[PDB]
């Protein structure tokens, strides 16, 4: 009955863990302690096979290690920065009145490393926006922002009041000072059945052809502007984009990243430094 | 049962697409590949008629190409600008304390081009207002705006505190700084059964008679004022009017606009420039 | 929260081998311990091997 699944869900008891059964001394030709790891299978041996156990009613649950629990938390994926101007000519320009950001999960290591535990992932994305407009003068002025999602092949804005900001077909969300953090869902939007966290392939046959997950699905661009025209007092605006996966599926688990990331969409790990090589978290003894 | 239509609606599976049936080699007097386009009908031939197909269970849906999906998105249709004054005499004047805008879908090309894919359209209009008041001095002051819809033949305001702003019969909406974006519906309001996107007709028989869709239905005027009397620090106010069609019907599809718009309610396309003629998006090779 | 793409139908979910539902499925797989972890071995496969001899 669905009420049992609801009660288990509010208790976080959906994913029950086996009890420890009582065991006793054994003298047998069966040797659970011995196996062949050469098979590629992990030994099935459990505590009851190798020590005399008591009965324990196991209270633990695995709900918080579900992939929905593990990946389904909001983390920063972009910091989008622009510095407004009192000059009408400069306020129209990129980096001043508006900024663009090529969408990916690749720029922030905390999120990137978690999703890269899997080869393929499929999820809907909850986006939440945290804007902080640092006043450089004696007043904030009126702060109204527009965030426009520009899909691949749609025209990207080149000016703060370009025709593209009309948003006649693109999704836009508006934010003004004192408004709660903007939030919207992007449904799972790949042309494939899952996102590639990794892709051992190319966009072509040639020396110049691109390699890796960047080939597989262009994710479009977030464009942000201040909607307000030029104002007396400048603002250093930073919009932080937070992403939570929802309705998550993940396939083909991978070793975690063991060394610093160097570049987006690349497994490259060799640093630029000539004295310092790539560093692991294995401590010597 | 209505629950099936609800489930299809939340999945976006209302408009199912045919499966590809399996096909085999054919040798016949029937020649699906041959037709007469002179008839004005498009050939009915499908992949199964011209290649050996496998069975494919087609997952695609047409929900997002519905006219409700295509036209039912908020796009900018006006930018209404006025610059407030600290001078009590100047703050009363048009362009300073208040502004008027003759209603149409004609001024912003992104919306205009989409609706002009059809000859006639019928919809209710959701209006949303995005106000950005750029502070020109050290403080915003108290910003309260009134947007008044003035139907055809109702008296248009000539002063910021004229009697017409009493709004005893006109619809007005008030906005103040920090208030969420104003929103209201205008029902389908033509004297005809649909809006004319195009009209091959005149308001009269004479050389001076107007031609085209401007004849067919005057849409009234949005009047915006700052309700606040004159204040110490000026504001460059821009109100952006966003329009979403709802409950949409559309008739008689048309070729899309292939060249820049030049004027409102006019199909005219010849630019003012003597070196540069009208430009298409057909690239040479 | 509202969808930014209001009629969008996601691409069909195909069967892909190796779905993971819980991280404990991954913890239940043996992985090698770098037991040797001396300064001479931590840049090499040798950190995973413990020496035995007469």
């Amino acid at each position: 009955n669905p009420v049992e699944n609801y009660i288990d869900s509010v208790l976080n008891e959906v994913l029950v863990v086996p009890n420890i059964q009582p065991s006793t001394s054994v003298s047998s030709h069966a040797a659970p302690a011995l196996d062949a790891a050469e098979t590629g299978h992990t030994s099935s041996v459990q505590p009851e096979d190798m020590i005399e156990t008591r009965y324990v009613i196991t209270d633990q649950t695995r709900d918080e290690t579900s992939i929905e629990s593990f990946l389904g938390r909001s983390g920063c994926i972009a910091m989008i920065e622009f510095n407004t101007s009192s000059d009408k000519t400069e306020h129209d320009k990129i980096g001043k009145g508006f900024k663009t950001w090529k969408v990916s999960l690749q720029e922030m290591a905390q999120i990137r490393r978690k999703y890269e535990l899997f080869t393929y992932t499929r999820f809907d994305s909850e986006i939440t926006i945290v804007t902080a407009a640092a006043a450089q003068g004696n007043d904030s002025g009126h702060i109204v922002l527009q965030f426009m999602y520009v899909p691949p092949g749609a025209p990207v804005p080149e000016k703060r009041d370009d025709y593209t900001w009309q948003s006649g077909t693109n999704a836009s969300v508006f934010w003004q000072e004192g408004q709660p953090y903007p939030r919207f869902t992007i449904p799972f939007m790949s042309i494939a059945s899952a996102y590639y966290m990794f892709y051992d392939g190319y966009d072509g046959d040639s020396a110049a052809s691109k390699y890796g997950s960047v080939v597989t699905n262009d994710m479009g661009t977030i464009c942000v502007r201040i909607v307000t025209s030029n104002q007396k007092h400048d603002s250093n605006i930073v919009c932080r984009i937070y992403h939570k996966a929802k309705h998550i599926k993940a396939w083909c688990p991978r070793p975690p990243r063991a060394v610093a990331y160097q570049h987006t969409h690349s497994t490259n790990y060799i640093p630029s430094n000539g004295e310092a090589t790539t560093q692991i978290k294995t401590r010597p003894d | 049962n209505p629950v099936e239509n609800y489930i299809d609606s939340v999945l976006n599976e209302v408009l199912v697409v045919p499966n590809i049936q399996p096909s085999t080699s054919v040798s016949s007097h029937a020649a699906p590949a041959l037709d007469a386009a002179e008839t004005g009908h498009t050939s009915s031939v499908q992949p199964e008629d011209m290649i050996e197909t496998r069975y494919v269970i087609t997952d695609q849906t047409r929900d997002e190409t519905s006219i409700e999906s295509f036209l039912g998105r908020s796009g900018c249709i006006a930018m209404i600008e006025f610059n407030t004054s600290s001078d009590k005499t100047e703050h009363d004047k048009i362009g300073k304390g208040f502004k008027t805008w003759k209603v149409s879908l004609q001024e912003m090309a992104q919306i205009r081009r989409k609706y002009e894919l059809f000859t006639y359209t019928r919809f209710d209009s959701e209006i949303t207002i995005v106000t950005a008041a750029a502070a020109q001095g050290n403080d915003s002051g108290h910003i309260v705006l009134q947007f008044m819809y003035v139907p055809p033949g109702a008296p248009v305001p000539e002063k910021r505190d004229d009697y017409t702003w009493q709004s005893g019969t006109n619809a007005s909406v008030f906005w103040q700084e920090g208030q969420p974006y104003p929103r209201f519906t205008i029902p389908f309001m033509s004297i005809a059964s649909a809006y004319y996107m195009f009209y091959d007709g005149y308001d009269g028989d004479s050389a001076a008679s107007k031609y085209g869709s401007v004849v067919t239905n005057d849409m009234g005027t949005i009047c915006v004022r700052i309700v606040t009397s004159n204040q110490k620090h000026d504001s460059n106010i821009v109100c952006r009017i966003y329009h979403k069609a709802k409950h949409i019907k559309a008739w008689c599809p048309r070729p899309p606009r292939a060249v820049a718009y030049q004027h409102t309610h006019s199909t005219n396309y010849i630019p003012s420039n003597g070196e540069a003629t009208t430009q298409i998006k057909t690239r040479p090779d | 929260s509202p969808s930014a793409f209001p009629y969008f139908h996601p691409t069909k979910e195909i069967f892909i081998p190796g779905q993971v539902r819980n991280l404990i499925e991954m913890c239940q797989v043996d992985t090698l311990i770098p037991v040797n972890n001396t300064q001479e071995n931590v840049r090499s496969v040798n950190m995973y091997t413990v020496d035995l001899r007469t």
Partner: peptide, 17 residues
């Protein structure tokens, strides 16, 4: 569980499996 929006993607976290 009440769903306020017309899209499946708009719903909160899915049930565990």
């Amino acid at each position: 569980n009440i769903n306020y929006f017309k899209d499946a993607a708009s719903s909160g976290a899915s049930r565990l499996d």
